[PDB]
Amino acid sequence: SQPFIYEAHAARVVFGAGSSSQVAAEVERLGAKRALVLCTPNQQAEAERIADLLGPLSAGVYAGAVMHVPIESARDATARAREAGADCAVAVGGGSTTGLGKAIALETGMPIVAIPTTYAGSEVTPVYGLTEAGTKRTGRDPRVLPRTVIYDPALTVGLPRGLSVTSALNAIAHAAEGLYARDANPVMSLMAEEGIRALAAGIPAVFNDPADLDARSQCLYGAWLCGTVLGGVGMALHHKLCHTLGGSFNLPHAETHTIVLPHALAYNAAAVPEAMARIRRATGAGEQSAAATLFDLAQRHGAPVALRDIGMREEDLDRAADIALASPYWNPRPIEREPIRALLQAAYEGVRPD
Amino acid sequence: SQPFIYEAHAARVVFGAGSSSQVAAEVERLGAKRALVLCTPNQQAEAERIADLLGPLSAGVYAGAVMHVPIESARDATARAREAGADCAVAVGGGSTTGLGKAIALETGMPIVAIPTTYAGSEVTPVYGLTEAGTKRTGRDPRVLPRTVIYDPALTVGLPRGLSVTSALNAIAHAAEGLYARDANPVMSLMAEEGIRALAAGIPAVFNDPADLDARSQCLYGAWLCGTVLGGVGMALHHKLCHTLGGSFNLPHAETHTIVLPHALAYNAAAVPEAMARIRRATGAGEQSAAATLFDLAQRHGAPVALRDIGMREEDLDRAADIALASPYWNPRPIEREPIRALLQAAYEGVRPD
Ligand SMILES: NC(=O)c1ccc[n+]([C@@H]2O[C@H](COP(=O)([O-])OP(=O)(O)OC[C@H]3O[C@@H](n4cnc5c(N)ncnc54)[C@H](O)[C@@H]3O)[C@@H](O)[C@H]2O)c1
Ligand SMILES: NC(=O)c1ccc[n+]([C@@H]2O[C@H](COP(=O)([O-])OP(=O)(O)OC[C@H]3O[C@@H](n4cnc5c(N)ncnc54)[C@H](O)[C@@H]3O)[C@@H](O)[C@H]2O)c1
Ligand SMILES: [Ca+2]
Numbered sequence: 100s101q102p103f104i105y106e107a108h109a110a111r112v113v114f115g116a117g118s119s120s121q122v123a124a125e126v127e128r129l130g131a132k133r134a135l136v137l138c139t140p141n142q143q144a145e146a147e148r149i150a151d152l153l154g155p156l157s158a159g160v161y162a163g164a165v166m167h168v169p170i171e172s173a174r175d176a177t178a179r180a181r182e183a184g185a186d187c188a189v190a191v192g193g194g195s196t197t198g199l200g201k202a203i204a205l206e207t208g209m210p211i212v213a214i215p216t217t218y219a220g221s222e223v224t225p226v227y228g229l230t231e232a233g234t235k236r237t238g239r240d241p242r243v244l245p246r247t248v249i250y251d252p253a254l255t256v257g258l259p260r261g262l263s264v265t266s267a268l269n270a271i272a273h274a275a276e277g278l279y280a281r282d283a284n285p286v287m288s289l290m291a292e293e294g295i296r297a298l299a300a301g302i303p304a305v306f307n308d309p310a311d312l313d314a315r316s317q318c319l320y321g322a323w324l325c326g327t328v329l330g331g332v333g334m335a336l337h338h339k340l341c342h343t344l345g346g347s348f349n350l351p352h353a354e355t356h357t358i359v360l361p362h363a364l365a366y367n368a369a370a371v372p373e374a375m376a377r378i379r380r381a382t383g384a385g386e387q388s389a390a391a392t393l394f395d396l397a398q399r400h401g402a403p404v405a406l407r408d409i410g411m412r413e414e415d416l417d418r419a420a421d422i423a424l425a426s427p428y429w430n431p432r433p434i435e436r437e438p439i440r441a442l443l444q445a446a447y448e449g450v451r452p453d
Numbered sequence: 454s455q456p457f458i459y460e461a462h463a464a465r466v467v468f469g470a471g472s473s474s475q476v477a478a479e480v481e482r483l484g485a486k487r488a489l490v491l492c493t494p495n496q497q498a499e500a501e502r503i504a505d506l507l508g509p510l511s512a513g514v515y516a517g518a519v520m521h522v523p524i525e526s527a528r529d530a531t532a533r534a535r536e537a538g539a540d541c542a543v544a545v546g547g548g549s550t551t552g553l554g555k556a557i558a559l560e561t562g563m564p565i566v567a568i569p570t571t572y573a574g575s576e577v578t579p580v581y582g583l584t585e586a587g588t589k590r591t592g593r594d595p596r597v598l599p600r601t602v603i604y605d606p607a608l609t610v611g612l613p614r615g616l617s618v619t620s621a622l623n624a625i626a627h628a629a630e631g632l633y634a635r636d637a638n639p640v641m642s643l644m645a646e647e648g649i650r651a652l653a654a655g656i657p658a659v660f661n662d663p664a665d666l667d668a669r670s671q672c673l674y675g676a677w678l679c680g681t682v683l684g685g686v687g688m689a690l691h692h693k694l695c696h697t698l699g700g701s702f703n704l705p706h707a708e709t710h711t712i713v714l715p716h717a718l719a720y721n722a723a724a725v726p727e728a729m730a731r732i733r734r735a736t737g738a739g740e741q742s743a744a745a746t747l748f749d750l751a752q753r754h755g756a757p758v759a760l761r762d763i764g765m766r767e768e769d770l771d772r773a774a775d776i777a778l779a780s781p782y783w784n785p786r787p788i789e790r791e792p793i794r795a796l797l798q799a800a801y802e803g804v805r806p807d
């Protein structure tokens with residue numbers, strides 16, 4: 100019963116198997132006449148189906164989305180949008196594709212329709228990212244928040260078995276830290292816990308059958324709730340450290356989240372037992388720790404659990420601990436060198452937390 | 454997982470004991486320079502405290518709000534606003550005061566800051582009502598949605614023992630029908646169930662001590678969630694029938710919802726077992742039906758459970774049934790005269806549902 104200020108962003112979310120077939124209707128609803136479809140080179144097939152659904156509303160497909168939105172990709176995409184007379188951007192892909200859409204919207208003001216194909220949750224946050232001279236700069240601007248999100252679990256069926264797990268833990272991370280945010284509120288916490296519950300149940304169902312559209316729906320729904328928590332309350336240690344590892348050492352995004360989460364939770368656990376108890380309840384932990392339970396959820400379904408396995412040099416951990424301590428931020432427990440360095444060593448080695 | 458389209462209004466909600474002290478900042482935040490405070494003649498003391506907190510931002514207090522927003526109060530209030538040069542209205546009170554505020558916003562476009570003191574939930578719906586030539590017509594329009602809502606449980610301490618119960622059941626009714634709405638969605642249902650849970654626990658706590666600020670927070674929190682469901686999904690038999698009874702027979706509002714809800718639930722129960730299971734879970738029903746449990750929640754806490762106790766004439770029941778069947782609207786179980794008339798007989802006499 101502590102006071103709070105709740106803010107909800109305007110949102111329009113179209114959800115269900117086959118929903119991507121209504122893409123033209125959603126562009127028309129925005130009053131847009133020339134929508135540019137965005138994707139990575141690996142998702143051109145999906146992008147083409149979207150472009151075909153748009154028919155004469157299509158401004159073409161720009162298939163150069165790239166991880167962490169290099170500022171020169173943002174420029175190139177925006178140039179193409181301008182050249183096509185685009186008045187709308189339709190992002191078909193994961194966090195990186197949404198991110199290119201966000202960059203175009205940042206420079207042009209045009210609406211974005213997001214069609215997410217991972218569990219990253221970027222489609223519902225006002226946070227954008229640009230990588231310049233190797234370092235990712237992020238900011239917040241309502242302008243980058245997609246006007247409409249179309250969640251179609253059919254587009255996640257082919258999400259590979261690995262990323263389906265690791266992106267799912269990335270989403271759980273948003274919710275886990277949301278529960279202990281300095282600006283936590285009951286509504287965000289309600290959605291946080293439900294999001295964790297949905298993903299915790301969906302990971303094994305999807306792992307057993309990646310073509311199960313109900314299991315896929317349950318994960319996408321969880322991803323939406325998690326992303327909503329990310330967009331509404333402040334993150335802390337886990338997200339900051341993942342940014343450090345990803346940005347300073349080029350570690351793959353979802354996998355870094357997956358490996359770090361249990362150790363970031365172990366670090367903060369003593370400080371926020373109420374949030375931990377909610378994470379445990381939502382993950383079916385029983386008497387187990389939140390940390391151990393999330394570790395097992397990753398491990399049991401084939402995700403890597405050691406930074407060693409995703410390209411982190413053991414010899415860079417000392418530097419990683421220094422960078423983790425460089426730019427201060429609020430966290431429930433103080434960020435100190437030694438225990439951060441020990442968190443990093445345990446994450447490196449893939450030690451199951453107690 | 455069945456498909457849906459979730460739309461959400463931008464929202465700002467300041468919640469907690471003492472939040473009404475922030476009213477001046479909330480008005481400046483909207484860019485307004487002259488807020489007219491609105492209330493019923495019974496709540497002028499609280500309006501004055503608000504007008505004083507507004508200091509130089511105060512355009513004064515209009516103390517003429519009335520049940521079901523008579524069109525003349527509406528026009529008079531607007532005049533006062535207009536002659537004050539007000540660019541903002543602060544509604545301090547229950548649904549009737551929020552209503553006047555909605556009426557002024559409908560006409561002039563000015564922002565409303567809602568400071569609710571009952572559990573009706575109007576503060577978060579786009580529905581407005583006007584009474585003209587003794588008959589109340591409603592409509593919907595985003596323009597009537599308050600830009601900011603300030604929930605201060607200290608302003609509900611003096612909500613009388615009777616209305617505290619009946620208003621709370623009016624709130625529960627919104628969540629209950631929201632759980633079986635044709636356009637039900639998982640987020641609205643998550644809030645619906647949470648709303649019912651808060652109010653089911655809060656009613657007896659408030660009954661035990663009306664000055665208990667935690668009990669009062671719990672109720673107001675529940676009211677907000679239930680109001681949000683009321684504004685996001687379609688209601689059915691319960692709300693339609695209450696509008697008929699209140700409108701055509703001039704029955705007291707909160708009392709009518711309270712009396713009708715168990716019987717509208719009993720009518721629908723067999724069509725929507727899953728929604729009934731969530732209602733039973735949220736109300737601690739155990740093996741009892743939702744209908745019986747909500748009847749008991751009213752009765753145990755001294756609310757009326759028979760329309761006869763609030764002035765309905767038994768000879769008018771046939772006409773109420775006629776009006777209840779006047780136009781076909783969607784409801785999970787088909788609306789048919791014989792079982793509707795029997796529902797009315799049961800509500801009229803206060804027969805506890807099985
Ligand atoms: N701004 C924010 O609020 C926010 C939030 C979360 C993530 N992000 C950012 O998003 C990026 C991470 O995004 P991500 O983890 O979604 O991965 P990604 O967008 O970088 O996708 C990784 C690869 O998977 C492929 N892929 C994605 N969905 C697929 C599908 N369903 N079927 C087949 N292949 C598919 C993509 O084409 C890509 O090649 C990072 O840059 C991260 O920082 C930003
Ligand atoms: N538009 C919508 O979505 C919607 C939803 C619910 C109700 N309503 C409308 O609201 C009206 C009824 O609302 P209501 O049930 O809030 O009652 P009310 O607003 O009519 O209040 C009843 C009486 O109780 C007093 N009161 C209210 N709060 C008090 C407090 N905290 N302490 C002491 N006295 C207090 C009021 O001054 C008034 O005299 C109806 O006209 C109904 O249709 C509209
Ligand atoms: Ca070595």
Ligand SMILES: [Ca+2]
Nearest residue numbers: 417418420421
């Ligand atoms: Ca060092």
Ligand SMILES: [Cl-]
Nearest residue numbers: 368375388389
């Ligand atoms: Cl724990």
Ligand SMILES: [Cl-]
Nearest residue numbers: 722729742743
């Ligand atoms: Cl039941």
